[PDB]
DNA sequence: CTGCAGGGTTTTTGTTCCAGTCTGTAGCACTGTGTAAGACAGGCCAGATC
DNA sequence: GATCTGGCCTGTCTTACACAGTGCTACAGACTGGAACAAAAACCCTGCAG
């Protein structure tokens, strides 16, 4: 006879121990033999391995998280970080938080009030500092925050209409916030370089990249202007005796995820007056900071800083604007060489870089006074297109994104052209170009899987550069010489294109850079011969620059692409999404909010706490 | 004395509120343009032609020995009457730079040759200032006097950005009245000397003053130190004694609280004052006229021409006399979408 | 020699097994020899007893909550709900998910796959059923999902085009979905009634109200209608003398959280063609539904269900446009009686209810044949304005909201005419009327602090029909006689405003209903005495209705605010919020998604989790 | 053969892509308006005016003994030739209602009297049909014939939904063609008879046909079953013998692959096609004269009027003939915002 | 006793395969397909006078 | 009246300006078993190094 065997997990713990005592002794003595009496860890490990044999990873992770410490709640930092990282309203966050708190709470998330404090150490206007020498014509107050861009603008109706609403910070405070953020990583790099952390702490060097682009369709577009900056690369000279050591160069400056906005204004990008009226103070204070030095408690030590500023992150027309170049298809084609448009057909490579800010100021004054009584367009010639007193100094360089987009549309256009005929039909009519573009996009669609676009898009250009689209379309070409010729041109382009796309070719790929002059010469002369009909004397500007200035600027300023305004443009999406669903509909405060929210979006503190081990 | 709804055919986007309208040798010339001069016309000035409520703007060209002028925004204007040795001049100083800056520089503008084919040559000369020079200001008021019997230029008024020491980046767009000094200048030589006035309490702006036969009459304007608009005009007489240009002033107790009005000279010294702003919101809608005299102001309010609901409703306005009892005014317009001629235009005339 | 051996918990699981192989196979063979080969239960009990030996009761109880207790955070349900309850898109949800997973390990939330499948538990077409008798002219397929409203609309351009984009659910399916949702509270009402559950499985009584109302300002064609409906209550008819005991009764019917959409189409409210062409099958199933008995596994028990409906949720305009009457301002205004225009002014208190959908059909037939060979206006009069064929049965009831809106605008222009003196000046002028408009605007801007609007919202109405607004504007009308007149007017009006605005007037203001007859008659006679100036023979239809129809309808049905349709209006805001945020966006998918989201938005099985654990 | 674009002044919404025209003694009346009548036009029929390119509409009234008629959409239309007993009827049956349902009812339309001032009185008599009555259907065809010398009227064609037994909530707009069966009808009394033919392999719809002198030609349309537009011709020789009106038919070599065209009359049996649809996606666009004779049908291509690029680029087009070789058509207007006149309008003619 | 190279040790750690499965991340249809400003070239042309 | 020409017109060119984030789907990567295998991490162990 006997008692029937029931399920082991249903009887009392008395019967459990009864039926398991033998294996309990086995596990006890095994733990004592192999690990010295650790029954708990041995039974734990065996249970976990038995669970994982069935591929039940989830419950094993659950139980292990319950053991060896816990994750009951959350730190407030990552909480607010996540909140801003997915563009939620305070109402939303509260509903969700109260909800989950009601359910197995154990309140994990955190309520709003604690968040809305936990960031004043991240938002600007919070960290004490000072300068030596003092900043000229600049308040020493280290506490101020969001300021309406009006700059104490007299509301006087009789005078200039004081109309536009704007917001911004004080440039210095944004810089020092950026530093105090990166401080953890500058200390990390100090340790990586193993240099002393106590001394050699007064001669750092921070590279600043400024940038500004307009942005339409922000509702009439309402066409508001965005202005941003970014820390590019911080170096150190101390204690001297050397050139400088880059502690932290940004790895992905292209990414908008490291691009902090500084000033927002509800104005068009073209109207110069209001633009200046709200930009002047900023450029003035930047010029002021160029001389003095900053003092900040970083790494517990009162260290010091000086800076260097690169005016790159801009479109062409704006550069011309705040430089005073006659936008855009002027007789003076290049911002950086002074050649004529026409003469840029005879020569296309040998060109020097002399266009510098103060020089342009001098040339403008020589325009104004005309110390030579010379004729009007004569004055235009001698000044070399300098007739508009500029104010904003910029680094004389081009953006990668725009060179790419312009050369992409040039490619697209010439493809539509030579699908029809140019050197066998000299003067084509408008409907001809229309039908040629239609059938060109037909070819680009049937294979290569691209849909047409009203304007040039970035990834659109990326695919527009693939040789495979060329092999697809050029099949439509009747010629063989010109067909394989445009193939070879695409070839040269692919060979020498990533040169400016590169982050640092001197470290990425010096090869093409060494023969960049040579391939540029090849392609330039191939165009001059096989396509003189189209480029007799008229030249797209970006092509002039890339065929007459790329290697020099690459040699001078570290690299290119590392300064493209591309990340600026990307931020528009942010400013789009932000304006969509995180505000009360009030203008005086819409920017006052959107700034705060967006300024959050860029923090290695926050971004790291967001990655959290991938 | 009535209006007419004009229409500017093209270029209806190159007109900010503040600009100048200079009349010499017949045709009228617009100075001051939104944004820097395009290559369409480098010298920026435009000859105005009014035809059938339509507005044509012809480009201008200078001499070769001339100088080039930035489009000063709310500058000081002076008609130097035709007399020896170079009739007949305009004087522009010192204005607001389109790129937001100031220029204490003084400009003498004149006409040189014409046409042959109706294209009229102009010229501009930077008249250097020695002093005791006037600081860079805007909205100030300068005119010309001929006392026993020689000719000088009197400047007063105008605001200025905070001094270059208290220039606060957060107050950068603040601007207060310049110190109240009159500036007496000979065009040649530029012996610009300043003079105090113990009765002139402070500076001011938009006070469209006037001088007659070396006797000046400052009608009240705006005082930002007080936000007040004391109507009373202030008379004064300047006497070009050798070599001290002695001065006298007098507090006329009755004037007019007006800011930046339009004054068309009708007679030799008969001036109709069209309109401006008596308040921050209440614009001077009523017309005005003063005959000038050794007795001085002799004021009558003419019949104010009818006003379209358009000009009634817009927040503000601006304009200037086309000369000869005639003027042009503009209204910041609306439209959905942008017209983009952001201003509607109206001619106005006397009699 | 030998390498120092580390702590078992820190080794690699490969090396952990490499070194534990002995006891691993020992526990394996112990399970196989003694416990039927269940290694999992063996090691579970090993860890459990080892922990409980060290006084680790808290960790042991938490582990026992993990094994055979669904831990792993909280639930798939609340996860999906919170996803809905704040309109969060999927990429965002996954971004938060991976984040809270990496930092603060032991993920609480569910991944995407879990909630995708969990949908089909609350999507329509998941619980099986059938009809007795079988549903006529209806496919018996029960597992179907979303269908575009074309109902086989052949796309022949030769014929009328299929240019209309529409989506819908199958009516019965959303019905059974909502019921199976509310099986929880139906079992709980059975509980509260202390009522049997094995018995009384046949005599359930379910009543649903419905609505349909388009809206403009949908662009960047242009318009769409959101046809919806919601259960109201459910009682018990078994087994005799007991007429019915409300088992469930809705508490917030006017609320948005009780508004179940069924079909949406990119159409205007006006063109009667497309509306019928789409909604036809809905009408057919509606009428085919009254008869058969539905079988549902409610509370695990297969029980029968029957249904009564009362069409209420329609504005006056749509009410008419599905009744074929004169739209809108013709001599026939009472959608219930056959009053003329001036007769509603002649007598303003003595009217009965006559307009009955069946009689509407019957008299449209008279229009059709004219069996008496009568003239156009002659037959129109004899037929009492039965001008078209009726199309769908609605209960001859009233909308409280827009009737209040009519009271509001009427008293508004009363004020606009009393600031001026119309009883002295019987023909004032347009511009003087606009000046009286602007002075009324500034008057109510100073007092009561209200801004002007070109078209009015409900808050404007309620804040206008206030004695404080009366005495604020009365300061402008100089005649202290007219002041007291319209003061007592507003007084007696508010003496009855809650009567129709009551959710349960039988309880919320029964004495207010009792004297309603006298109050309304006083209203009409005061009109005739002092305000006849305006109401000689012209009135507004809504007033007519609030005068001679309120008590009849409410006594016959129970309330008005109960059958009020308000929700759909503000729910249009929700429809917009949904579309512009969660759209695909693709026309064939825009609705095909927003409908899902929307239907999800209104399950008590979710909303309780917002209020259930909150109080 | 000319087209001229028209613009209707005070009518821009009442017509729908499927509608009809009816002429009685040169007088044109539009039939079929969008939705039920408003308070404006309780009849829905409009006397049409086309004068100096402008299109006006006016409302009509009826007698009292005349019952009114809901706005059918695509019925079969048949002009009863004016003869004993009652001239001059014009037949209406049976189309589909505004509520997407079908009539399956026979109405006779007639004139009663006039005027006074260009006013015309009309009448509608619903006559019950005895049978063996046809089922509800739409898009069908019916015409009159005489057999020495009896008068009959025969119908065939049309689409309809699935029978109510399989009528499915998801097929509620699915439709198929009618069975290939004709129905002969004496007008007095309202007798109806159904008949099938062995050559009649399949039903159809949308098809136009012409009857004359006891024989009819059934012309091209499209069949949904095989999705084909068979360009054959049908021709039935029919006669009325007491009391069995026997009926024979034949298939000619070729008819035409056209779908739902605009047929104008010019002579007794000289008619013209202004194009229907050749392909489901591609419109046939040219004209085609067709006479029918006792010898047979005789068809010839013609010169198509010079189509506007817009009418060339419409996706749809439709209408009827104003009569006597003149027709009117409309095109869905494309614009955001809409004009909101949903259709351009054109007037076409021959010779 | 030191020095280092390298003899042994057990213990990480991956190492090979055939079936899964649970997940996260990639790929996707997709809106809409012209704008707006200014430079400069030249075409023409009125107006005005030579 | 001739002309011519200063200027206005029309056209063509060149540089910015919009289209991404979204639910759905499919695949890939990431995990379970046995054997027996190299390669290392670091103790210890020996041998040759003074
Ligand atoms: Ca740009
Ligand atoms: Ca850009
Ligand atoms: Ca409404
Ligand atoms: Ca409405
Ligand atoms: Zn260059
Ligand atoms: Zn009634």
Task: Considering every ligand atom shown, identify the ligand nearest to the alpha carbon of residue C455 and give its number.
Answer: 3
Same domain, A183 and A206: yes
Tokens of D283: 């419109």
Range 187-246 of D in CB contact (< 8 A) with C: 206, 222, 224
Any atom of strand E under 7 A from CB of C33?
no
Chain A span 196-255 residues with beta carbon within 7 Å of strand E: none
Residues before each break in chain C (C–N > 2.5 Å)?
220
* SS3 at position A88: coil
Residues before each break in chain A (C–N > 2.5 Å)?
219
Cα angle A530-A532-A536, degrees, rounded to a multiple of 5: 165
Contact state of C74 with A103 under an 8 Å Cβ cutoff: yes
Q: Which residue of A has its CA nearest to C51?
A: A40
Tokens of B308: 């379209």
Rounded to 5 degrees, φ, ψ at D125 are -110, 115
Distance from CA of A62 to the nearest CA of B (A): 56
Same domain, C47 and C106: no
**Ramachandran region of residue C43, left (φ > 0), alpha (ψ -120 to 50) or beta?**
alpha
Evaluate whether B168 touches A152 at the Cβ level (below 8 Å): yes
Strand partners, B228: B223
Same domain, C39 and C85: no
- Residue position matching structure tokens 């579970």: C44
Evaluate whether C310 touches C230 at the Cβ level (below 8 Å): no
CA–CA distance from A554 to each of A377, A549, B237 (Å)?
A: 35, 9, 68
Same domain, A182 and A261: yes
Chain B span 92-121 residues with beta carbon within 7 Å of strand E: 116-118
Same domain, C153 and C291: yes
- Nearest residue to C594 via CA among C606, C582, C611: C582
Same domain, C96 and C203: no
- Nearest residue to C181 via CA among C607, C604, C612: C604
Q: Å from C144 (CA) to F23 (C1')?
A: 21
Helix axes C480-494, C467-474, angle to 10 degrees: 170
Helices (H) and strands (E) in chain D, counts: 1, 26
Beta strands in C159-221 (DSSP E): 166-168, 204-215
> C269 C-alpha to center of ligand 4: Å?
9
- Residue position matching structure tokens 């007299």: A154
Contact state of D99 with C153 under an 8 Å Cβ cutoff: no
Cα angle D46-D51-D54, degrees, rounded to a multiple of 5: 80
Residue C71 domain flag: no
Contact state of D170 with C281 under an 8 Å Cβ cutoff: yes
Q: Residue C203, class by beta-carbon neighbours within 10 Å (0-12 exposed, 13-18 middle, 19+ buried)? A: middle
Same domain, A539 and A493: yes
Tokens of C346: 């002649």
Range 306-335 of A in CB contact (< 8 A) with C: none
User: Is there an interface between A and B (3+ Cβ pairs < 8 A)?
Assistant: yes
Contact state of B98 with A391 under an 8 Å Cβ cutoff: no
Same domain, C375 and C425: no
Range 550-589 of C in CB contact (< 8 A) with A: 581
Strand partners, D185: D153, D192
Closest residue (Cα, C1') to F44: C1
Strand partners, C552: none
- Distance from C-alpha of A503 to C-alpha of C268, rounded to nearest angstrom: 55
Which chain A residues are closer than 8 Å to C67 by Cβ?
A: 59
Rounded to 5 degrees, φ, ψ at C333 are -120, -40
The boundaries of the domain holding residue C21 are 8-66
Rounded to 5 degrees, φ, ψ at C569 are -60, -60
Q: Residue B37, class by beta-carbon neighbours within 10 Å (0-12 exposed, 13-18 middle, 19+ buried)? A: buried
Q: Does A108 touch chain C (CB under 8 A)?
A: yes
Contacts of B293 (CB under 8 A, 6+ apart): B212, B269
* SS3 at position A345: helix
Q: Tell me, in Å, the resolution of the deposited structure.
A: 4.7
Q: Which chains touch A (3 or more CB pairs under 8 A)?
A: B, C
Evaluate whether A149 touches A169 at the Cβ level (below 8 Å): no
Same domain, C281 and C346: no
Handedness of CA C264, C270, C274, C277 (dihedral sign): positive
Handedness of CA D186, D191, D195, D200 (dihedral sign): positive
Q: Å from A428 (CA) to F11 (C1')?
A: 14
Same domain, A460 and A545: yes
Question: What is the tally of structural domains in chain A?
Answer: 5
Strand partners, B348: B3, B327
Evaluate whether C39 touches C27 at the Cβ level (below 8 Å): yes
Instruction: Give yes or no for a cis peptide into B189 (omega within 30° of 0).
Output: yes
- Distance from C-alpha of D351 to C-alpha of D349, rounded to nearest angstrom: 7
- Distance from C-alpha of C233 to C-alpha of C244, rounded to nearest angstrom: 11
Rg from Cα positions in chain B:
20
Rg from Cα positions in chain D:
20
Contact state of A159 with B139 under an 8 Å Cβ cutoff: yes
Tokens of A601: 């979006």
Q: Residue A199, class by beta-carbon neighbours within 10 Å (0-12 exposed, 13-18 middle, 19+ buried)? A: exposed
Evaluate whether A180 touches A127 at the Cβ level (below 8 Å): yes
- Nearest residue to B279 via CA among B262, B312, B297, B256: B256
* SS3 at position D21: strand
C213 a known binding residue? yes
Which chain A residues are closer than 8 Å to C106 by Cβ?
A: 61-62, 65-66, 71
Evaluate whether D251 touches D199 at the Cβ level (below 8 Å): yes
Query: Which helix or strand (DSSP H or E) is residue B151 part of?
Result: strand B150-156
- Distance from C-alpha of C467 to C-alpha of C597, rounded to nearest angstrom: 43
The structure's method of determination equals: cryo-EM
Residue C3 domain flag: no
Evaluate whether C454 touches C395 at the Cβ level (below 8 Å): no
Tokens of C55: 């006084």
Residue of A169, A223, A273 for testing the chain B interface, max B β-carbons within 10 Å: A273
Tokens of C216: 């403009």
The DSSP output letter for A146 is: -
- Distance from C-alpha of C97 to C-alpha of C88, rounded to nearest angstrom: 12
C217-229: b (≥16 Cβ within 10 Å) or e: ebeeeebbbbbbb
Residues C418, C420, C426, C432, Cα dihedral to 10°: -130
Evaluate whether B257 touches B231 at the Cβ level (below 8 Å): yes
Residue A7 domain flag: no
Contact state of A9 with C103 under an 8 Å Cβ cutoff: no
Any atom of strand E under 7 A from CB of C382?
no
Query: Strand F: which positions are within 7 A of a protein CB?
Result: 4-9, 12-25, 31-33, 36, 41-45
Residue C278 domain flag: yes
Rg from Cα positions in chain A:
32
Q: Å from C11 (CA) to E13 (C1')?
A: 10
Distance of CA A590 to the CA centre of its chain: 23
- Distance from C-alpha of B238 to C-alpha of B145, rounded to nearest angstrom: 8
Question: What is the tally of structural domains in chain B?
Answer: 1
Q: Residue B298, class by beta-carbon neighbours within 10 Å (0-12 exposed, 13-18 middle, 19+ buried)? A: exposed
Which chain C residues are closer than 8 Å to A108 by Cβ?
A: 104, 108
CA–CA distance from B114 to each of A376, B25, B123, C318, C582 (Å)?
A: 17, 10, 12, 77, 69
Evaluate whether C486 touches C492 at the Cβ level (below 8 Å): no
Evaluate whether C293 touches C192 at the Cβ level (below 8 Å): no
Handedness of CA C238, C239, C244, C247 (dihedral sign): negative
Instruction: Give yes or no for a cis peptide into B116 (omega within 30° of 0).
Output: yes
- Distance from C-alpha of C110 to C-alpha of B271, rounded to nearest angstrom: 83
* SS3 at position B161: strand
Residue C420 domain flag: yes
User: Is there an interface between D and B (3+ Cβ pairs < 8 A)?
Assistant: no
Evaluate whether A547 touches A348 at the Cβ level (below 8 Å): yes
* SS3 at position D155: strand
Evaluate whether C143 touches C129 at the Cβ level (below 8 Å): no
Task: Write the residue in C51, C92, C106 that is nearest to A61 by C-beta.
Answer: C106
Query: Which helix or strand (DSSP H or E) is residue D90 part of?
Result: strand D90-93
Same domain, A448 and A585: no
* SS3 at position C450: coil
Query: Which helix or strand (DSSP H or E) is residue D111 part of?
Result: strand D106-113
The boundaries of the domain holding residue B135 are 1-351
C569 a known binding residue? yes
């Amino acid at each position: 006879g006997g008692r029937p065997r029931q399920h082991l997990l249903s009887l009392t713990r008395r019967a459990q121990k009864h039926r398991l005592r033998d294996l309990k002794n086995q596990v006890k003595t095994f733990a004592e033999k192999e690990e010295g009496g650790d029954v708990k860890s041995v039974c734990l490990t065996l249970f976990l391995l038995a669970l994982r044999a069935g591929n039940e990873h989830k419950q094993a992770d659950e139980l292990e998280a319950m053991m060896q410490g816990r994750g009951f709640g959350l730190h407030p930092a990552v909480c607010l970080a996540i909140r801003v990282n997915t563009f939620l309203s305070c109402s939303q966050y509260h509903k969700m938080y109260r909800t989950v708190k009601a359910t197995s709470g154990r309140q994990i998330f955190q309520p709003l009030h604690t968040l809305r404090n936990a960031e004043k150490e991240l938002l600007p206007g919070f960290h004490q500092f000072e300068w030596q020498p003092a900043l000229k014509n600049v308040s020493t107050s280290w506490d101020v925050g969001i300021i309406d861009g009006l700059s104490g603008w007299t509301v006087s109706v009789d005078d200039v209409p004081a109309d536009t609403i704007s917001r911004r910070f004080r440039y210095d405070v944004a810089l020092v916030s950026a530093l105090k953020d990166l401080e953890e990583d500058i200390m990390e790099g100090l340790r990586e370089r193993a240099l002393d952390d106590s001394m050699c702490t007064s001669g750092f060097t921070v590279v600043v990249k400024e940038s500004c682009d307009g942005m339409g369709d922000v509702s009439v577009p309402e066409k508001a202007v965005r202005f941003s900056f970014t820390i590019m690369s911080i170096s150190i000279r101390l204690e001297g005796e050397d050139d400088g050591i880059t502690i932290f160069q940004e790895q992905k400056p292209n990414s908008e995820l490291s691009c902090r906005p500084l000033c927002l204004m509800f104005v068009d990008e073209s109207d110069h007056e209001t633009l200046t009226a709200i930009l002047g103070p900023v450029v003035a204070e930047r010029k002021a900071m160029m001389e003095s030095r900053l003092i900040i408690s970083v790494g517990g030590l009162l260290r010091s800083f000086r800076f260097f500023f690169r005016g790159t992150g801009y479109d062409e027309k704006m550069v011309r604007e705040m430089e005073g170049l006659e936008a855009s298809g002027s007789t003076y084609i290049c911002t950086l060489c002074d050649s004529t448009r026409a003469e840029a057909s005879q020569n296309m490579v040998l060109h020097s870089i002399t266009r510098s800010h103060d020089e342009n100021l001098e040339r403008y004054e020589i325009w104004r006074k005309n110390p030579f009584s010379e004729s009007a367009d004569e004055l235009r010639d001698r000044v070399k297109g300098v007739s508009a007193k500029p104010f904003m100094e910029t680094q004389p360089t081009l953006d990668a994104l725009h060179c790419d987009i312009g050369n992409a549309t040039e490619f697209y256009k010439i493809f539509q052209d030579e699908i029809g005929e140019v050197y066998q039909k000299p003067n084509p009519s408008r409907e001809e170009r229309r039908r040629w573009r239609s059938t060109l996009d037909k070819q680009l669609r049937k294979k290569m899987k691209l849909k047409p676009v009203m304007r040039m898009n970035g990834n659109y250009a990326r695919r527009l550069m693939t040789r495979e689209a060329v092999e697809a379309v050029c099949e439509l070409v009747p010629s063989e010489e010109r067909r394989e010729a445009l193939l070879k041109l695409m070839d040269l382009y692919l060979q020498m294109k990533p040169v400016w796309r590169s982050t640092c070719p001197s470290r990425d790929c010096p090869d093409q850079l060494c023969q960049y002059s040579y391939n540029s010469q090849q392609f330039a002369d191939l165009l001059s011969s096989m396509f003189k009909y189209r480029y007799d004397g008229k030249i797209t500007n970006y092509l002039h620059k890339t065929l007459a200035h790329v290697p020099e600027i690459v040699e001078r300023d570290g690299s290119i692409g590392a300064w493209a305004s591309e990340g600026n443009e990307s931020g528009n999406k942010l400013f789009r999404r932000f304006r969509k669903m995180n505000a009360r509909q009030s203008k005086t405060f819409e920017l006052e909010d959107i700034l705060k929210h967006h300024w959050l979006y860029t923090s290695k503190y926050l971004q790291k706490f967001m990655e959290a081990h991938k | 004395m009535s209006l007419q709804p004009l229409t500017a055919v093209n270029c209806g986007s190159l007109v900010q509120p503040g600009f100048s309208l200079l009349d010499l040798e017949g045709d009228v010339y617009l100075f001051g343009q939104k944004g820097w001069p395009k290559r369409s016309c480098p010298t920026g000035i435009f000859g105005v032609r009014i035809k059938k409520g339509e507005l044509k703007l012809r480009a201008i060209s200078f001499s070769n020995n001339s100088s080039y002028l930035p489009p000063l925004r709310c500058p000081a204007i002076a008609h130097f009457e035709a007399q020896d040795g170079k009739p007949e001049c305009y004087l522009i100083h010192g204005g607001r730079t389109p790129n937001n800056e100031l220029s204490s520089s003084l400009y003498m503008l004149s006409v040189d040759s014409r046409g042959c084919n109706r294209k009229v040559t102009l010229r501009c000369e930077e008249k250097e200032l020695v002093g005791d020079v006037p600081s860079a200001r805007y909205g100030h008021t300068l005119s010309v006097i001929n006392s026993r019997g020689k000719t000088a230029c009197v400047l007063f008024g105008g605001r200025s950005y905070m001094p270059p020491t208290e220039r606060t980046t957060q107050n950068w767009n603040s601007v207060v009245d310049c110190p109240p000094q009159v500036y007496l200048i000979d065009l040649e030589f530029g012996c610009c000397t300043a003079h105090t006035l113990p009765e002139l309490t402070d500076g001011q702006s938009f006070h469209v003053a006037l001088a007659r036969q070396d006797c000046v009459y400052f009608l009240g304007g705006h005082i930002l130190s007080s936000d007040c608009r004391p109507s009373r005009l202030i008379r004064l007489h300047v006497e070009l004694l050798l070599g001290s240009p002695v001065l006298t002033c007098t507090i006329l107790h009755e004037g007019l609280t007006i800011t930046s009005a339009i004054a068309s000279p009708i007679g030799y010294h008969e001036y109709i004052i069209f309109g401006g702003y008596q308040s921050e919101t209440q614009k001077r809608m009523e017309c005005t006229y003063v005959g000038l005299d050794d007795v001085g102001v002799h004021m009558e309010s003419r019949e104010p021409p009818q006003w379209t609901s358009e000009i009634s409703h817009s927040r503000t306005w601006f304009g200037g006399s086309l000369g000869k009892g005639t003027a042009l005014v503009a209204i910041p317009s609306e439209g959905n979408p942008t017209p983009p001629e952001a201003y509607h235009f109206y001619q106005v005339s006397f009699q």
